[PDB]
Amino acid sequence: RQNPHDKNQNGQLLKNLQITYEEIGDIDSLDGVLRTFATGNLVSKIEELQYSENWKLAQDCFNVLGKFSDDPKTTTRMLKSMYDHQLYSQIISNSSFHSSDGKISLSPDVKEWYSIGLEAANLEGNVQTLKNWVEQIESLRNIDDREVLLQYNIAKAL
Amino acid sequence: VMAMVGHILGLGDRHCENILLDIQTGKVLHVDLDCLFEKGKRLPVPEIVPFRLTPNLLDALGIIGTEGTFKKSSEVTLALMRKNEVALMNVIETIMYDRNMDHSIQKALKVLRNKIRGIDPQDGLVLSVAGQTETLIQEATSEDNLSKMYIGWLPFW
Amino acid sequence: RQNPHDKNQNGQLLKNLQITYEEIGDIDSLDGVLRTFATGNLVSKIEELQYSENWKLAQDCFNVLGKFSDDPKTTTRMLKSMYDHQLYSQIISNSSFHSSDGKISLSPDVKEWYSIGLEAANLEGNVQTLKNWVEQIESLRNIDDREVLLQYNIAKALIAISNEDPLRTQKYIHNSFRLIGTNFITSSKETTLLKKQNLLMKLHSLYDLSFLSSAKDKFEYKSNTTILDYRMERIGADFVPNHYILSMRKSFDQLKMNEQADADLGKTFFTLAQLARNNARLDIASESLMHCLERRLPQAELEFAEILWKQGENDRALKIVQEIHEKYQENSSVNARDRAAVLLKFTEWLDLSNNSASEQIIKQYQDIFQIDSKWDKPYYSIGLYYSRLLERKKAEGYITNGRFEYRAISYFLLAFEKNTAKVRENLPKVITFWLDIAAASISEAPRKEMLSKATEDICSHVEEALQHCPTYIWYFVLTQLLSRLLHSHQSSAQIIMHILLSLAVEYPSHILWYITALVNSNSSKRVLRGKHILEKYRQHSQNPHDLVSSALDLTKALTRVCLQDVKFKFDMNVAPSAMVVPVRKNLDIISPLEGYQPFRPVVSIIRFGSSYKVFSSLKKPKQLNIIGSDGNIYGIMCKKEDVRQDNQYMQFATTMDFLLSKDIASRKRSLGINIYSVLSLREDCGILEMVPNVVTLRSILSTKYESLKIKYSLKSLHDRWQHTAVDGKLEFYMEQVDKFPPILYQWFLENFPDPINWFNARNTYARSYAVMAMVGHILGLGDRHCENILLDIQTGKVLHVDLDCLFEKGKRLPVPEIVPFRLTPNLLDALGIIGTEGTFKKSSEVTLALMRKNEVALMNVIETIMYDRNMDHSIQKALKVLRNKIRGIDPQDGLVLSVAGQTETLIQEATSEDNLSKMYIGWLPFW
Ligand SMILES: Nc1ncnc2c1ncn2[C@@H]1O[C@H](COP(=O)(O)OP(=O)(O)NP(=O)(O)O)[C@@H](O)[C@H]1O
Ligand SMILES: [Mg+2]
């Protein structure tokens, strides 16, 4: 409000504004923020689907946006949209982890992937895909991540 | 919710001494409610708003204004009133035996039934919940309407 | 049937019986076989889902049945259920193949897996998962499988076509042609085209790879793509081959990394998307359209709006389509259609969304008309809008004004002059609005003077439209023009005479039959107008012949050969004539598409037949013959009954079957009804057409009961029934049905010993009987005794021919006809093993749903009964009962019942033996 909002400062203000609603528990303002003064990209019109009962229409749109291999965050958007809708068996069967059998090396943003992939593997009880998973985790060097190690310890407990 | 629970009952008379807010949690209550059944249109410079939606209240709803929790909760309210037309009309049948024998009470109950089911009061046929919501909002915040009504219900505040 | 089926031999008989339906092309008996006498296992109730629009509910049930690892066939059931529903990317990503990276050894049943896994890998163009796949194939020893090697060779052709090697992929596609030309291909002139189509789609996907590989530059590659898009027009409109061929062009264009190939590839993804959203399969339309956003087409913003509209959510689709509409307040973005069609779609599913008042839609309807006015689909849309809003106000307490019909007619008549392809289903809605407010302006004209001003100039709209619209389009409402002439208006009476003058100048010879029956009545008013319509005809310029006087010479002869009851060989040289034959292959209109001639070519009368025939009924009408211009014996039936009732039945039939040929719930199942051009001549007489190759099922049952030497009677048969009391009817009926075994299931054998013709003939029988089975009941047909269920030997259609009583008149006689329709134990097992729970029930439900969806048009067609027979009150009660039967109200305890509910009600009161005992032995039920 203190900004004159009629100008074009509403590009850098919004990409973290939706962050401050999508985990606050409120949805009906987030869906109201997305459909007002933010109608440039069509991907913004796609992400309104995943909160309004047609979420699986946005899932398989994200799955083929997720097979473009251009950005790492458009992959973790797919993974978080799976995890928010309890598609755990579809998370552990994702090809973004399984290169052939194992996974990639030390993790700048990949740990946010592993945090999901551990957790769904805890929720799908299957000792082989849970056992080779922490076989791949323990090849790492220095797991800095606060979130990975919880689901890791639950996995080795299982 | 009460923004068109009152309008369906034809509340009116919504001047600023009757929109009471509680300091504890921020609920909204309406207290005067002497006129119902759109009686506020039957007086000089008549109240032709559906409900007091007024530019202090719009940005009070947030940045996005009326296109937010207000609109979605309005749609949920109108859908729940359409789903329960028979019970709500059955509750309000007792107006016809509190005040017994009027014919204006019959016209009021028929207009009430059409407002519950979602018929637009001009060119009367059934409109959707999102359609009825957009109609009532875009005729409540319409400045050509908000210029007209009496300064007892002072709109510019 | 020859087995006593009541015992427990129906365990080993069924597990291959479903195999003999699930690839025969038929579904509605397979779904009928599964839900009858097979209700033990729940997995059998699960497999009914994968054919009834909830297939993805059965998919993920099969996926977790498919992770039990107990049987190999419950895995290939999952794989075939994926492949039948085009989930190719889900097939190649299956864990049943990928143990870790590779696959298992030599294949007893695993080859049936690989046959799928190759094939989906051909349809998902991805060189790595296609290359390691045939790396795993070529580790094998001796691939015996006839099916694996085709998709293998297509796979290695695709791998070579990614490596930019033209002669190598030509070599492997020629290997694929060798394998199909020897092994997969079978004999023609025995099988259908339905089973050959599964191989023709693979051949059409093999040719275009050789046609796109043989190109060294983009200059001929663009021409190759236009040739293939030309080859995408002979393909038809079924989803499976369309998706298969476009999937193979997709798989070509993303293995060959040319930039022109990528520009082709975006086009193929957009065509897959708009293909799949028209076939109610938007599960893959979205994940094909999202490829067009990485290419960033400026057309995907509307395609995602159509996907959102087909999904179900309306408001977000409206928001994105108005977002791209106010994006069209920017630069050029061609003004003719790409702006007007976007705004038209916005208005059309703003109407459908029910999210606006009327004037908000009209204020941009006129904006559509401002931005483009040489294109009549917006005028069609606004005509449908007013001719929908008139009912949506008329459903409440709204009374007759004129403006909502004034604007409706003013946009319909302006619409018809441009593309004339929506005339059959809208012009009857026009000229019933032309003659409702006109009669209301006579009934109580002294405010409602507005409709008096409205009827002042909709007549002016008809006059100003007739001078520059085509002529033939009035013929569709011709009998409705033949009725309502006695309208008592005196300003539209001149125009309805002018509309027969104008229709008699151009194309006379068809309508001259109607215009000579027009100057014929007992009430001397139709004939008085018949001189006026024929005084001015010869006053017009083109009078090629004395065909009016010879037309009356045919007419008075044909109406005097119905009085001469004998219980003669008159005038003969009237034929030949330029007058054309009364057969229904003269008098229809060819389907208006976008210079054509509106008729089949003239097959005129040449030699009137001499040896007539009279039939053996109580009231005896008589059959003549015609030799036409080709020399075909065209049968002609002259009855001494008012067939003006029978024409409106037939116009109901011809507005019913052309709706049946448009619904995808019916065109997938190929519904239809028989039809024949019936014409009146005068009251209590008429002519009607003879469908050839037909037989009564009295004649079918007479020659099969006597072939089994079953001794029965016809006069001693019904007096015993007459002497029975109210209690003995049931025992008499049960004794008579134990007398005659049902035998109609082998008359179809004796006509069609070729079993494929037998199977198609029985399906055509069940479906064609199923539609008219309650098209007659809704019209209240009755009188359906065995001399009136006519079957054709050629293909097995069912026609109903007597139809003298309609509007449930058959209940108004002693021992009344209280069946809905003749469903009778010869006919039940004639429908198949499962009886009425099969194609009969499903096609019945489709028929009733299509009649409920089109209540207004069908009632509008049958409104002309009220002006054929003018002033009855029983006609009003008949029309109200007809409306309630159309909408689906049960005639006892009247309230609205579902389509499956109304179907089960009519069937379980038609086959009810307590009802079938009651009715008279003229309609003898035990046969
Ligand atoms: N369009 C047609 N195609 C073939 N046969 C037909 C056709 N119309 C009538 N028929 C024949 O005409 C016979 C009966 O004609 P119909 O119109 O019923 O006169 P009818 O005297 O009323 N017979 P009915 O009412 O049963 O006593 C049928 O059994 C058919 O053989
Ligand atoms: Mg007060």
Ligand SMILES: [Mg+2]
């Ligand atoms: Mg007060």
Ligand SMILES: [Mg+2]
């Ligand atoms: Mg008959």
Ligand SMILES: [Mg+2]
């Ligand atoms: Mg008869």
